[PDB]
């Protein structure tokens, strides 16, 4: 629940420009996007895992959206029509937009990317591996073990055990 | 002792000498029970009472061994029980405090006369 | 949780049947309650873990949250029946579907 | 939160009337409905909608007569003399026995039941003035013998715990 | 003796038993091949996992070629 | 058990299911253990050459399946409201769990299936029904701290199991009504001390396990079969019939000891009225025990003439007379025991 | 109210199934069908409990297995009635 | 208009205890759509069940 | 709206099931009951697996029960009653009217669907029945599965023992 004591970011902070591209336009050029935004995505997702609070990593989300917007401006300035043809092929070629259905326009788009920015396409499993980075922010401390100074105590094994006085003391037995 | 300390009440000082039957009563009673059980078996099968003495000797040995083993287990059980009681008294000294001993010269009970 | 009476090796399979530790949002709270249920015991844990029991209870049972939601929904319909809330402005602005 | 949610000893005896009537008739209702629920299905089945309610009334209403007569007799005997005692409960038990005799058309049942309920009344009055309870909450509740921590026989290994007894 | 009777009267049971024994041998070979290398640490991981450099899971990350 | 190794398999799965039930730290594991125990105990108690054993198996099946479904229902409700395995404060769903457990155990007023089904059984399956099948519901009652419902069950069980056993002259239904009366002493000990309940259950199962062997060997399914039972010495029948005075709680026999430890633990825990109500109950149980004891205490009987030799098993009658000695002279082992400290 | 708006319904349907199980019917197989209905409503209530929790719905097949073995036990008891009687009338069985 | 109501608490009783004072727990799906019609709830929740 | 309709249909079929003497009326009523219960159970889980499993279970069970209908109580009279039809029709139209005039946000189930789970849940993006059915074959509870295999084998041994095949076929007045 959200109460008055919990702080929230204001409406002026969350009113920035967001990526409004469709799914086929995001899937086209998706492999070239992460080679340019590897640092922002990994930092944002690492601090989103451990911090687990949407108020934290807001500036990391701003950096992720700014990197994606800068990459899409760089795609838009040079050979926008090849990206349009690749996104149209990926939209219209299959239900699930698989890259294996049409690869000729993918080759033309990768040729234009290599001719313009000298960027190569990564392999098919570059982003699905475990990614290790060095983070600028410090790691959050591991929780200390809970302390219980008044626990339920038992008889310790080093306690002395003399024989019982008067035996069982229960109905004449000793 | 002018006070009744529970620590002094529970600590075995060693002035209680055990009886003559104290280490030996359980094995001889269990051996008598085993011999009587074998006698009762021989009586119900219409044998002579002292016919099969192999059963008598085996039942007596089983009884003496079980009596000695469970008497030892009883002794460590009672030792651990008094250790638990002593440790619980030292763990909470406020609920079991030292009480001053109060003689009959400071007590006015109500005597009950017949007439 | 309950206790095993006359516990044997046969309770080792049974003990991990239903618990909140497998990828649940509540289980850490449950783990904390189990911590004092290992420390204080099952009987002292009913009295000395009243804060940790209730957090897990309204975390997985969602009792207080759903009573809050049904008080928020009933007050709006009560204002509509009493005439304070107009029928055109009866519902507020909807959230985005990409939210939550 | 009503007059039905009242007890017999919420007030001193003789001070209140209607709460005592409602409470003692509530135990009479519970006993009569329970006995008639284990009666009309099990032995002497009425096989009708109306004789089932007739057997319900037959097993319920005389218990209301018992409860009302005992409570009114105890109230009259408490309001008559200044002191409260046991023989008020004894004569209330005799009044309930007379109600039993009016039920069963047998004077001998009425007396014997009057003596038994008078003995029950004087024992209950001894309970309420001496302070002891018939069914108390149990002070000593053994959940096991000695070494209940020490007889954990499990084959799986314990992972290290997240709690310590050490102060920070 | 009993193999000829089973191979004469119920030959599909004998062929299925041969197929099941081959499957048990291939399951043993597959488990031994999976646990001979670091099979628990798979090359491609489900979800988006990020490890810090001081994490003990960081140096276990493979660097193979696709 | 008898005549098949698959019955030994059914006993093995019976022990496995009951020990799965009582060791469960959740109600669902206890429920599935009760399912395993029910699965194990349907085929024993079924015999196609007996017309009434199948009806007894059907009565047991319907009673246990109704009681197991109510038990799972209220368990699911307890998990729905108070999300842990137990309940912090007692409520009505704990009473539904306790009532569904009391239908399994056979206590009053849910007792009615128990002696009506025991007429259809043999003696060994009767002994498995009223000793081992009362392990799993009675040990699950211990997790519930309810006093009024348990007290009503105790009072009703000791009243009915004493009164109800007077009418039947058949030994199986009489011993079933005796097991109902001894169930009330177990449930009265269940809310003061679990160890004292275990001791009363062990000695009650010991006395049941020695009284079954006298009836299983010689096939004594009726009261007058005891009067016609041939022994080669009347002093032997006089000694063999002392186990009913043991089960009646008469000192100095062995069965005075578990009743006595229940009475001692009840008076230490400040219960006196229901203890007095259980004093008047066990006199009636001793009264219908004495109608069996008419068959050996008068020392001479007008007996049937044609039978001349009595026959018994070797190992069964050998194991019977070990425990008959300990059911009479068992109070000499009062110094050996160390549970009660 | 919260117990009334959510999961109060299968308690009522389980009570109706219990009343169908114990009603005076001529045949045992109607009681077996009422057992199948109370298996269905216990499945509903157990499924509500196992779906408040995220990934603990694997238990919902075990209850199905123990319930099917209950139904198989009832069906084999219905076979064993024919080994002794000629019928499945509940009036035809021994009341004592 | 409700006198006993406080924002974010059930009549003054806090929903979550043993937590830091500035933490944020994720609210339930019903409180997120507590100010909306059934069309938004069926728009979000009934995605898989319709197609 | 569909959930409240399934509520009304389950209530009406439960009223019908409590009132039917004939075993085939109970069989058809529990057919439509298990259809409606299978759809309702599906609404609560992210995936639709256990509804399918429960439908295979409750169609494998009553397939046998019809053979026992035709072998025992094959000849029994159906009795249609106008009171039950009028009661079921009036209660059904009343609950459809009451469900139409009800707010469906308050009457909806609080159990989380596959789309009611938030976007940040990375466990929701996997295959839909993987993590739900995982613990059947994982290390802490494989032994319960072992116990279920042995329990089903013991069940089959019990069925073979108490249904003696060599005593002959079963019918009325055998
Ligand atoms: C009648 C009594 C008088 C008879 C006349 C003769 C005189 C006898 C001695 C009189 C003593 C003083 C009178 C008195 O008021 O005593 C109160 C007193 C009760 O104790 P208390 O101090 O009031 O408080 C007790 C608890 O602390 C607090 O108790 P509680 O409020 O928690 O109890 C809840 C109460 C609440 O009652 C109700 O809710 C019932 C009424 C509501 C309507 C129900 C309608 C039907 C159900 C609808 C459900 C929906 O329910 C019951 O008490 C149920 C009792 C059921 C008894 C039978 C159970 C059989 C069960 C079988 C199946 C299992 O003592 C007695 O009642 C004992 C006397 C009666 C037994 C005498 C036996 C003599 C034998 C010879
Ligand atoms: C708290 C909450 C819960 C409270 C619950 C309380 C209520 C239940 C208590 C039950 C107590 C009890 O035991 O009652 C027994 C008692 C005696 O039962 P009975 O009806 O005499 O005997 C029934 C036979 O034994 C039956 O024996 P049978 O097995 O031989 O009968 C054959 C059976 C055979 O039944 C079947 O095979 C089942 C068929 C079901 C589906 C039908 C679909 C039809 C589609 C068109 O036929 C029926 O049951 C008739 C069904 C007719 C069709 C119903 C259509 C509507 C429901 C649709 C459900 C959803 C399915 C849709 C389709 C799905 C497709 C995938 O029941 C009643 O008395 C019923 C209540 C009547 C109350 C009064 C009704 C209103 C007033 C009527 C008179 C108005 C006069 C106006 C005069 C105006 C001018 C003056
Ligand atoms: C009557 C038959 C049943 C009687 C049971 C109790 C008999 C007395 C007993 O065993 O006391 C134990 C006590 C044991 O106490 P103890 O002082 O010997 O202490 C030893 C106790 N252990 C071994 C546990 C450390 O026996 C005695 O005190 C002496 C008994 C002497 C013999 C009595 C025979 C009585 C025979 C009666 C036949 C009729
Ligand atoms: C008509 C039958 C009606 C039965 C009603 C039973 C009510 C009941 O038991 O209430 C619980 C009560 C519980 O009593 P209690 O002692 O626990 O009451 C104390 C209550 N507080 C703590 C609130 C002050 O049972 C009794 O009162 C039983 C009294 C028995 C009296 C007769 C004994 C002798 C019998 C003849 C020999
Ligand atoms: C035969 C069963 C032996 C073990 C029974 C057992 O542990 O009982 C509990 C106790 C010892 O267990 P304990 O020492 O772990 O304490 C009891 C605690 N529970 C039951 C929760 C585990 O034993 C007895 O009370 C004795 C039972 C046997 C009867 C005496 C004659 C032999
Ligand atoms: C799954 C697929 C099922 C396909 C067949 C559906 C049949 C629907 C019948 C609906 C009858 C409704 C009705 O009122 O019935 C009362 C009637 C009453 O009979 P009647 O003859 O009195 O009705 C005549 C009514 N008038 C006079 C108004 C025309 O009963 C039937 O119609 C018989 C129903 C038989 C149901 C058989 C079910 C078999 C199930 C097998 C599996 C389980 C074991
Ligand atoms: C030492 C004395 C111990 C006393 C304690 C009580 C003993 C009770 C008797 C035990 C022995 C017994 O049963 O003897 C019966 C036997 C009868 O003789 P019988 O064989 O019938 O005929 C003789 C002609 N052939 O009698 C005889 O043959 C005479 C036996 C004389 C000696 C008796 C004791 C010998 C056995 C050792 C002690 C056994 C204690 C058993 C206790 C059981 C109860 C706890
Ligand atoms: C509460 C404790 C009640 C204790 C009552 C003790 C006395 C007794 O049992 O009386 C029952 C009474 C006996 O009547 P009877 O001997 O036939 O005499 C005929 C002429 N008067 O019989 C009657 O008066 C009729 C039957 C009893 C009805 C009143 C007593 C009800 C007692 C509570 C029952 C609770 C539910 C029991 C369920 C049992 C299920 C098996
Ligand atoms: C001293 C206390 C213990 C006394 C025990 C013995 C006496 C029990 C009470 C009794 O028997 O009272 C007599 C009275 C007779 O009632 P009535 O119906 O006339 O007798 C029919 C005869 N077949 O019986 C009754 O009125 C029944 C009273 C109910 C309680 C009976 C308890 C036994
Ligand atoms: C621990 C468990 C010990 C017992 C294990 C039993 C496994 C086999 C169970 C079974 O169903 O075996 C089939 C049959 C048993 O005999 P059956 O035909 O069921 O009974 C006829 C008499 N009423 O058995 C046979 O026909 C095989 C011969 C007897 C069993 C030998 C192997 C188990 C030995 C133990
Ligand atoms: C029939 C006689 C039985 C007893 C024989 C003697 C046993 C003595 C006690 C057991 C040994 C104790 C050693 C400390």
Concatenating the DSSP letter of every residue in F219-269 gives T--SSHHHHT---S-HHHHHHHTTHHHHHTT-TTSTTHHHHHHHHHHHHHT
Q: Tally C-beta pairs within 8 A across C and D.
A: 22
Looking at the 3D structure of chain F, how many domains does it have?
Answer: 1
Dihedral sign, CA of G17, G19, G21, G27?
negative
- C-beta atoms of F325 and B37 within 8 A: yes
Distance CA F4, CA F44 (A): 11
Phi-psi map region of C95: left, alpha, beta (phi>0 left; psi -120 to 50 alpha): beta
Give the strand pairing for D163-164 and A146-147.
parallel
CB pair distance less than 8 Å for H37 and C94: yes
What would the two tokens of residue A26 be? 């995001």
Element (H, E) at E52: strand E50-52
Q: How many CA atoms lie within 13 A of F201 on its CB side?
A: 23
Q: Which residue's CA is minimally distant from atom 81 of ligand 2?
A: I83
Q: In the block, which residue shows the tokens 């709460």?
A: D19
Q: Which residues of A touch B74 (CB under 8 A)?
A: 168
Overall resolution, Å: 3.4
Contact by Cβ (8 Å): H10, C67:
yes
Instruction: Determine the Cα–Cα distance for residues D22 and F311; give it in Å rounded to an integer.
Output: 67
Q: Does A164 touch chain C (CB under 8 A)?
A: no
The CATH code for residues G2-92 is 1.10.287.3510
Domain ranges, residue F301: 1-341
Phi and psi dihedrals of A152, rounded to 5? -100, 105
Ligand at shortest distance from the CA of I156: 10
Instruction: Determine the atom of ligand 6 nearest the C-alpha atom of G33.
Output: 44
Q: List C-alpha distances in Å: B81 to B84, C73, F269, G72.
A: 5, 61, 20, 52
List pocket residues of ligand 1, CB cut-off 6 Å. D 7-9, 23-24, 26-31, 33-34, 66-67, 70, 93, 96, 116-117, 120-121, 124; F 109, 152
Contact criterion met (CB below 8 Å) for F85 and F77: no
Cα–Cα distance measured from residue B100 to residue C5, given in angstroms and rounded to the nearest whole number: 44
φ, ψ for residue B103, nearest 5 deg: -75, 170
Q: Does E57 touch chain A (CB under 8 A)?
A: yes
Q: Does the C-beta of D35 come closer than 6 Å to ligand 8?
A: yes
User: What are the contacts of F284-287 at 24+ separation with CB within 8 A?
Assistant: F284/F162, F284/F163, F284/F165, F284/F166, F285/F161, F285/F162, F285/F165, F285/F178, F285/F181, F285/F248, F286/F245, F286/F248, F286/F249, F286/F250, F287/F166
* CB-CB neighbors (< 8 A) of E48 in chain A: 45
Method used experimentally: cryo-EM
- If you measure from the C-alpha of residue I86 to the centroid of ligand 2, how many angstroms do you get, rounded to a whole number? 7
Shortest alpha-carbon distance between residue F147 and chain C (Å): 17
Contact G87, I172 (CB under 8 A): yes
Q: Cis omega (within 30 of 0) on the bond before F252?
A: yes
CA of I81 to the centre of ligand 8 (A): 43
- Cα(I163) to ligand 10 centroid in Å equals 16
Residues forming beta bridges with residue D167, ordered by sequence position: none
Structure tokens at B53: 């003495």
Distance (Å, whole) CA A65 – CA A41: 9
Instruction: Give bridge partners of residue D164 from the DSSP assignment.
Output: A147
Cβ contact E–G (≥3 pairs, < 8 Å): no
Q: What span, in angstroms and rounded, lies between the C-alpha atoms of F122 and F141?
A: 28
Angle formed by the axes of helices F273-297 and F148-163, to 10°? Answer: 20
Asked whether G57 and G50 are in contact (CB, 8 A), the reply is yes
Provide long-range contacts, Cβ within 8 A and 24+ apart, for F160-167: F160/F108, F160/F109, F160/F111, F161/F108, F161/F111, F161/F281, F161/F285, F162/F281, F162/F282, F162/F283, F162/F284, F162/F285, F163/F284, F164/F115, F165/F284, F165/F285, F165/F288, F166/F284, F166/F287, F166/F288
Bridge pairing between strands B99-100 and B3-4: antiparallel
Give D162's contacts in chain A (Cβ within 8 Å). Answer: 145-146
In three-state secondary structure terms, H8 is coil
Other Cβ atoms closer than 10 A to F230: 14
- φ, ψ at F147 (rounded to 5°): -100, -45
Q: Is the CB of D117 under 6 A from ligand 9?
A: no
Spell out the residues 6+ positions from residue H27 whose beta carbon is closer than 8 angstroms to its own.
A1, A2, C65
CA distance A160 to A153: 16
* Alpha-carbon distance values, A85 to A26, A80, A99, F71, H18 (Å): 13, 9, 13, 65, 56
Three-state DSSP at H9 gives strand
Torsions phi, psi of A131, nearest 5? -110, 125
- In angstroms, the CA F210 to CA F207 distance is 5
What three-state secondary structure class fits B100? strand
**F33 token code pair:** 């253990």
Q: Which atom of ligand 10 lies nearest, measured to the CA of I157?
A: 11
Crossing angle of the two packed helices G9-21 and F51-81, in degrees rounded to 10: 170
User: Which of C12, C16, C73 lies at the smallest CB-CB distance from I103?
Assistant: C73
């Amino acid at each position: 629940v959200i109460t008055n004591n919990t702080t929230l970011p204001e409406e002026s902070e969350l009113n920035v420009q967001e990526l409004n591209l469709s799914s086929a336009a995001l899937r086209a050029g998706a492999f070239h996007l992460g080679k340019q935004c590897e640092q922002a995505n990994n930092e944002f997702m690492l601090c989103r895992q451990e911090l687990d609070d949407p108020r934290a990593c807001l500036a990391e989300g701003k950096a992720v959206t700014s990197c994606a917007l800068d990459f899409f401006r760089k795609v838009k300035k040079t050979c926008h029509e090849e990206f349009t043809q690749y996104a149209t092929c990926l939209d219209k070629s299959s239900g699930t937009m698989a890259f294996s259905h049409c690869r000729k326009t993918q080759g033309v788009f990768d040729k234009c990317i290599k001719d313009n920015f000298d960027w190569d396409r990564p392999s098919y499993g570059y982003f699905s591996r475990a990614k290790v980075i060095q983070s600028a922010r410090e790691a959050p401390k591991k929780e200390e073990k809970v302390s219980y100074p008044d626990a339920t105590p038992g008889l310790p094994e080093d306690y002395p055990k003399p024989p019982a006085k008067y035996g069982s003391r229960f109905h004449w037995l000793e | 002792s002018a006070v009744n300390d529970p620590l002094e009440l529970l600590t075995n000082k060693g002035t209680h000498e055990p009886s003559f039957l104290s280490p030996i009563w359980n094995p001889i009673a269990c051996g008598v029970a085993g011999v009587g059980a074998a006698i009762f078996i021989n009586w119900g099968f219409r044998k002579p009472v002292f016919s099969g003495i192999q059963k008598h000797i085996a039942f007596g040995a089983i009884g003496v061994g079980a009596g000695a083993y469970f008497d030892q287990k009883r002794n460590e059980y009672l030792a651990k029980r008094d250790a638990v009681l002593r440790h619980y008294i030292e763990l909470h000294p406020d609920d079991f405090p030292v009480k001053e001993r109060k003689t009959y010269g400071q007590v006015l009970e109500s005597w009950v006369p017949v007439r | 949780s309950l206790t095993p009476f006359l516990r044997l090796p046969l309770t080792d399979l049974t003990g991990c049947l239903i618990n909140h530790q497998t990828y649940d949002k509540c289980g850490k709270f449950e783990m904390k309650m189990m911590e004092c249920f290992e420390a204080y015991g099952l009987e002292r844990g009913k009295r000395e873990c009243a804060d940790l029991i209730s957090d897990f209870q309204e975390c997985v049972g969602m009792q207080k949250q759903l009573m809050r939601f049904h008080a928020m929904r009933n007050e709006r319909y009560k204002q509509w029946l009493k005439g304070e809330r107009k029928g055109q402005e009866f519902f507020a602005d909807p959230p985005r579907v990409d939210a939550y | 939160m009503s007059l039905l949610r009242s007890k017999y000893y919420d007030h001193p005896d003789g001070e209140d009337a209607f709460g005592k009537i409602v409470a003692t008739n509530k135990y009479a209702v519970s006993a009569g409905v329970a006995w008639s629920m284990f009666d009309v299905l099990t032995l002497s089945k009425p096989q009708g909608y109306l004789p089932t309610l007739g057997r319900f009334a037959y097993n319920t209403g005389p218990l209301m007569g018992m409860a009302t007569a005992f409570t009114l007799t105890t109230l009259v005997a408490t309001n008559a003399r200044g002191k409260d005692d046991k023989i008020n409960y004894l004569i209330g038990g005799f009044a309930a026995g007379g109600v039993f005799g009016a039920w069963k058309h047998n004077h001998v049942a009425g007396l014997c039941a009057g003596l038994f309920l008078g003995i029950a009344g004087v024992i209950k009055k001894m309970s309420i003035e001496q302070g002891w309870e018939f069914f108390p909450n149990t002070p000593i509740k053994q959940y096991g013998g000695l070494n209940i921590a020490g007889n954990d026989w499990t084959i799986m290994a314990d992972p290290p715990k997240n709690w310590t007894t050490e102060k920070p | 003796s009993l193999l000829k009777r089973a191979w004469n009267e119920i030959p599909d049971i004998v062929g299925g038993s041969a197929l099941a024994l081959a499957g048990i041998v291939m399951a043993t070979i597959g488990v031994a091949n999976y646990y001979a290398k670091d099979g628990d640490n798979r090359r491609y991981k489900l979800g988006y996992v990020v490890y810090r450099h001081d994490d003990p899971r960081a140096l276990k990350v493979r660097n193979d070629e696709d | 058990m008898f005549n098949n190794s698959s019955k030994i398999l059914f006993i093995t799965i019976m022990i496995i299911g009951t020990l799965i039930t009582v060791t469960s730290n959740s109600w669902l594991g206890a429920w599935m253990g009760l399912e395993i125990n029910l699965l194990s105990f349907i085929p024993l108690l079924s015999d196609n050459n007996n017309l009434m054993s199948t009806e007894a198996s059907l009565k047991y099946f319907l009673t246990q399946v109704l009681a197991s479904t109510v038990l799972l229902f209220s368990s699911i409700l307890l998990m729905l409201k108070n999300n842990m395995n137990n309940e912090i404060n007692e409520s009505f769903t704990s009473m539904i769990i306790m009532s569904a457990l009391l239908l399994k155990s056979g206590a009053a007023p849910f007792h009615f299936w128990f002696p009506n089904m025991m007429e259809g059984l043999t003696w060994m399956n009767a002994l498995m029904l009223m000793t081992w099948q009362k392990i799993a519901p009675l040990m699950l009652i211990s997790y519930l701290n309810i006093k009024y419902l348990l007290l009503i069950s105790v009072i009703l069980s000791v009243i009915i199991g004493a009164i109800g056993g007077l009418n039947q002259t058949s030994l199986r239904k009489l011993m079933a009504f005796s097991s109902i009366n001894h169930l009330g002493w177990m449930l009265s000990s269940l809310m003061i001390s679990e160890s004292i309940w275990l001791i009363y259950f062990f000695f009650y199962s010991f006395l049941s396990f020695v009284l079954t062997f006298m009836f299983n060997i010689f096939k004594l399914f009726h009261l007058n079969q005891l009067f016609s039972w041939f022994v080669n010495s009347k002093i032997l029948k006089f000694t063999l019939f002392m186990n009913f005075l043991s089960l009646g709680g008469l000192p100095p026999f062995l069965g005075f000891l578990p009743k006595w430890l229940v009475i001692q633990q009840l008076t230490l825990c400040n219960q006196y009225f229901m203890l007095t109500l259980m004093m008047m109950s066990t006199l009636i149980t001793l009264f219908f025990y004495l109608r069996i004891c008419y068959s050996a205490f008068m020392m001479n009987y007008f007996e049937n003439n044609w039978i001349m030799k009595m026959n018994m098993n070797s190992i069964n009658y050998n194991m019977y007379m070990i425990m008959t000695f300990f059911s009479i002279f068992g109070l000499f082992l009062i110094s050996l025991f160390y549970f009660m400290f | 109210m919260i117990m009334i708006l959510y999961w109060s319904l299968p308690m009522i349907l389980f009570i109706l199934g219990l009343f169908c199980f114990v009603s005076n019917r001529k045949h045992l197989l109607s009681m077996l069908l009422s057992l199948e209905f109370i298996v269905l409503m216990l499945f509903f209530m157990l499924f509500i409990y196992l779906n408040m929790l995220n990934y603990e719905s694997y238990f919902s097949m075990m209850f199905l297995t123990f319930s099917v073995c209950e139904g198989a036990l009832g069906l084999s008891i219905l076979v064993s009635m024919i080994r002794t009687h000629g019928n499945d009338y509940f009036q035809s069985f021994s009341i004592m | 208009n409700v006198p006993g109501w406080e924002v974010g608490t059930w009549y003054g009783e806090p929903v979550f205890k043993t937590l830091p004072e500035d933490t944020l727990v994720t609210p339930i799906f019903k409180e997120f759509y507590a100010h909306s019609d059934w069309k938004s709830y069926a728009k979000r929740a009934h995605l898989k069940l319709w197609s | 709206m569909i959930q409240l309709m399934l509520y009304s249909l389950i209530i009406t079929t439960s009223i019908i099931f409590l009132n039917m003497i004939h075993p085939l009326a109970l069989g058809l009523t529990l057919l439509i009951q298990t259809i409606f219960v299978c759809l309702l159970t599906g609404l609560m889980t992210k995936s639709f697996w256990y509804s399918y499993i429960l439908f295979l279970i409750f169609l494998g069970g009553m397939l046998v029960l019809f053979i026992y209908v035709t072998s025992l109580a094959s000849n029994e009279m159906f009795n249609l009653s106008m009171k039950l039809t009028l009661f079921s029709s009036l209660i059904l139209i009343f609950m459809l009217i009451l469900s139409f005039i009800m707010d469906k946000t308050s009457s909806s189930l609080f159990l989380m669907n596959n789309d009611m789970q938030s976007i940040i849940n990375m466990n929701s993006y996997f295959m839909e029945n993987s993590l739900s059915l995982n613990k059947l074959y994982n290390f802490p509870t494989n032994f319960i599965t072992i116990l279920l295999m042995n329990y089903l084998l013991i069940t089959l041994i019990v069925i073979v023992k108490i249904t003696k095949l060599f005593k002959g076929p079963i019918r009325m007045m055998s």
